[PDB]
Design a protein around this ligand. Structure first.
Ligand SMILES: [K+]
Ligand SMILES: [K+]
Ligand SMILES: [K+]
Ligand SMILES: [K+]
Ligand SMILES: [K+]
Ligand SMILES: [K+]
Ligand SMILES: [Mg+2]
Ligand SMILES: [Mg+2]
Ligand SMILES: [Mg+2]
Ligand SMILES: [Mg+2]
Ligand SMILES: [Mg+2]
Ligand SMILES: [Mg+2]
Ligand SMILES: [Mg+2]
Ligand SMILES: [Zn+2]
Lengths: 108, 86, 53, 154, 50, 143
RNA sequence: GGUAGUAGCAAAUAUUCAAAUGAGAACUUUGAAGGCCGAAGAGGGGAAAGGUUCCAUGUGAACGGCACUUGCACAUGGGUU
RNA sequence: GUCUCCAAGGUGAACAGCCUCUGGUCGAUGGAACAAUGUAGGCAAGGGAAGUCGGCAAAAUGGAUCCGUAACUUCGGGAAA
RNA sequence: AAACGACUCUCGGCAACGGAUAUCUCGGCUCUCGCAUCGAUGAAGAACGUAGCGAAAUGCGAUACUUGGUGUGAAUUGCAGA
């Protein structure tokens, strides 16, 4: 199915004691695995803006918590091995912040 | 330092190509060839190197003129004449 | 397609470093068609090749 | 060409082979040993899993210093096994060629199984390395010949 | 070097001309034994030693 | 020491020409079966019987055996429990077997009647300074 | 041959995301981001030495100690006023 | 290993170290884990050379300003005592 | 229950690796015979060029894998053209 949801991902605990030079790339891999588990799609694409946000503070200072939007969409290409894929983009942080914020269904 | 480090300094040619024998054996500072002793009039050759003599002896080259001598001898060096007209 | 030649020629024509040349990622096919400095100048005039600040 | 083993009934069999394939002889031997007598479809699925790192090729003869894994437990009790992707890719290509030959022959692929499969050493190719104290050592490859035959069960 | 004598340059030109594969039609000649150019040279493998 | 210093220098003499079983060697450490003797029972907490709580005669504060924030890596103790002097084998949550003594306990230490005066229940996930959550809340003005 | 698919591939801070091509992309190209060289440089030229390695197009095999769609490799052309 | 020309901003005495601009570049086969033993780099309560052939290694000191500076001396120094 | 399998070893068929063996040879080695002919009228050697399509070998010298005379008498040949 085609479903869009917004998640809060606790990268701080997933990257605990990660070697500095591999922290941000490990963060990208961590987000990819999170998307795979949440949507069940092996093929996950990370938006350039989200990649910028992860790397915005260097290779060490990955944000502790990141709000992302994950959309499972049908892959139109016929040669593609997988029928569905997941797109991970940045999500807007409410004024109150991330405190009290759970998982939301975005699709109208 | 006498090994690999020392080999890093090789950019001055002791020898260049020889005018006479064409080998890279012309000692620039001595101004003489270690292979043929150019510019000495006589060629440098020694009996203690039979291989060196056979590398450069007569017949190893072209023999532009010499190769034709036996043919002229067989005719007794006939000159100034032609075959009878057809 | 590779645009290495176009990048080098644009760097030369713009009189800037190769790291300050911007080749439009959406105009790859038409940029690749240019093989002479005249074509590079035409592309620069058209705005497909820009010197970055 | 004459294969090492000829089928009992050639009319109901197909063959494929490769010569001087640029793959390690020992890994190829291990995977071929793993594949013998298996049905064609099961062999294809097994090799695909090996490429996906879901099933392992048990390393049995050329196993000195090989790591151990739980994946090869059912085939090799000691657990020694690996996932040589190059050898399985070449053997899968040869199996596809054999299947195409069977299709041309008119055989039905459902009951096909690997009657025979063998890996032989091909001619070694030469490169070299540089060792301490100004020495040079051989740096060789070990290509292999691969042949297989598919037969109709029963 | 950029500075080179005329004679050395001519010798280098001859060496460049001699560095090519044999014509294909040589292999079709009756009673041919030449398989390739056995005297091929690469600037990084064997130096001319001039 | 060339080639490292965390070693046994000489692992044996020339003769016998074999390494013996008595020489220290690197190998598995921990996860060994052990039997520890003479661990005195200081209290037997019975669930819902007023002996489960950590209240003593001297200290009348109403509190449970479980420390502030729970037992680290274990949880909340609610069933019967034994408070034993000293330490016992294994990490937290490890199942341990309790064995009746095989010896005759006649020593003065074994016969001693211990009377608990104070049982600490402060948080063990740090330098706990409060005994109860209510005490901390009163201290910080939130109660 | 055994050794053995073993010893090893570890200095010079570091890569990541999307797209294009391709049978095949961690390694090719484009864009974005995050880093390094930090002007007695990992920048820009010469002397010696090398001799076509220079530039364009294309690429079976070998080589580029993993890989390559790639290239100081290979093949065909051009270039030093 | 191999001669030489050009040489920005900040800090700072300083073509010291550290960061940055132009220019260049991420080229050192990649992935997972974080056992022993290693290599390189730190810390460690109390004691302070008891270690060792031997203070080996490490630690301690360190810039600038002010005060002050012994024996000895070839009268110059010692002295940054 | 040490059976089936794996490993090692062993024997046989087949397939590999390698190039021994046998059969060859426009080459070598040895003996014998005939002749006497390099060069300032520029030798030997050395360099560079030269073919429709050649790098090497062979040949040749801007008349450049050949010009001319004579002999022989229908080719050269890998391809194309004359
Ligand atoms: K192993
Ligand atoms: K390609
Ligand atoms: K001491
Ligand atoms: K002593
Ligand atoms: K056999
Ligand atoms: K003639
Ligand atoms: Mg002179
Ligand atoms: Mg080496
Ligand atoms: Mg604690
Ligand atoms: Mg300077
Ligand atoms: Mg080039
Ligand atoms: Mg200043
Ligand atoms: Mg023979
Ligand atoms: Zn000479």
């Amino acid at each position: 199915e085609v479903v869009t949801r917004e998640y809060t991902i606790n990268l701080h605990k997933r990257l605990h004691s990660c070697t500095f030079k591999k922290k941000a790339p490990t963060a990208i891999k961590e987000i990819r695995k999170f998307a795979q588990k949440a949507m069940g799609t092996k093929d996950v694409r990370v938006d350039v803006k989200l990649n910028k946000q992860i790397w915005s503070r260097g290779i060490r200072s990955v944000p502790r918590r990141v709000r992302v939007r994950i959309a499972r969409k049908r892959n139109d290409d016929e040669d593609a091995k997988e029928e569905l894929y997941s797109l991970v983009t940045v999500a807007e942080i409410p004024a109150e912040g991330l405190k009290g914020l759970g998982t939301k269904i975005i699709e109208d | 330092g006498k090994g690999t480090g020392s080999f890093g300094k090789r950019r001055n040619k002791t020898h260049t190509l020889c005018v006479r024998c064409g080998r890279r054996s012309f000692h620039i500072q001595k101004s003489r060839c270690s292979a043929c002793a150019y510019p000495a009039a006589r060629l440098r050759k020694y009996n203690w190197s039979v291989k060196a003599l056979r590398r450069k002896t007569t017949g190893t080259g072209r023999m532009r003129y010499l190769r034709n001598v036996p043919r002229r001898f067989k005719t007794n060096f006939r000159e100034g004449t032609e075959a009878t007209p057809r | 397609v590779s645009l290495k030649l176009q990048k080098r020629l644009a760097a030369s024509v713009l009189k800037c470093g190769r790291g300050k040349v911007w080749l439009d990622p959406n105009e790859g096919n038409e940029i690749s068609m240019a093989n002479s400095r005249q074509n590079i100048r035409k592309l620069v005039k058209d705005g497909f090749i820009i010197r970055k600040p | 060409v004459k294969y090492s083993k000829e089928p009992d009934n050639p009319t109901k069999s197909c063959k494929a082979r490769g010569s001087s394939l640029r793959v390690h002889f020992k890994n190829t031997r291990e995977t071929a040993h793993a594949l013998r007598k298996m049905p064609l479809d099961k062999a294809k699925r097994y090799l695909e899993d090996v490429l996906a790192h879901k099933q392992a090729i048990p390393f049995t003869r050329f196993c000195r210093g090989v790591g151990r894994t739980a994946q090869a437990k059912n085939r090799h009790s000691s657990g020694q096994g690996r996932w040589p992707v190059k050898s399985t890719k070449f053997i899968l290509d040869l199996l596809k060629n054999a299947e195409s030959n069977a299709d041309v022959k008119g055989l039905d692929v459902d009951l096909l199984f690997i009657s025979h499969i063998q890996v032989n050493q091909a001619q070694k190719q030469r490169r070299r390395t540089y060792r301490a104290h100004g020495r040079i050592n051989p740096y060789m490859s070990h290509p292999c010949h691969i042949e297989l035959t598919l037969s109709e069960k029963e | 070097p950029s500075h080179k004598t005329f004679m050395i340059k001519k010798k280098l030109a001859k060496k460049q001309r001699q560095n090519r594969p044999i014509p294909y039609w040589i292999r079709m000649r009756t009673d041919n034994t030449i398989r390739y150019n056995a005297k091929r040279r690469h600037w990084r493998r064997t130096k001319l030693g001039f | 020491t060339h080639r490292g210093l965390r070693k046994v220098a000489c692992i044996g003499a020339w003769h016998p020409a074999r390494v013996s079983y008595t020489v220290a060697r690197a190998g598995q450490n921990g996860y060994h079966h052990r039997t520890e003797m003479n661990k005195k029972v200081y209290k037997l907490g019975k669930a819902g019987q007023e002996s489960h709580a950590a209240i003593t005669d001297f200290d009348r504060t109403e509190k449970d055996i479980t420390p502030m924030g729970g037992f680290p890596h274990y949880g909340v103790v609610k069933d019967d429990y034994l408070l034993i002097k000293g330490c016992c084998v294994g990490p937290k949550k490890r199942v341990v077997t309790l064995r009746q003594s095989l010896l005759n306990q006649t020593s003065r230490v074994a016969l001693e009647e211990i009377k608990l005066k104070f049982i600490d229940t402060s948080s063990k996930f740090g330098h706990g300074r409060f005994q109860t959550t209510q005490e901390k809340q009163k201290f910080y003005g939130r109660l």
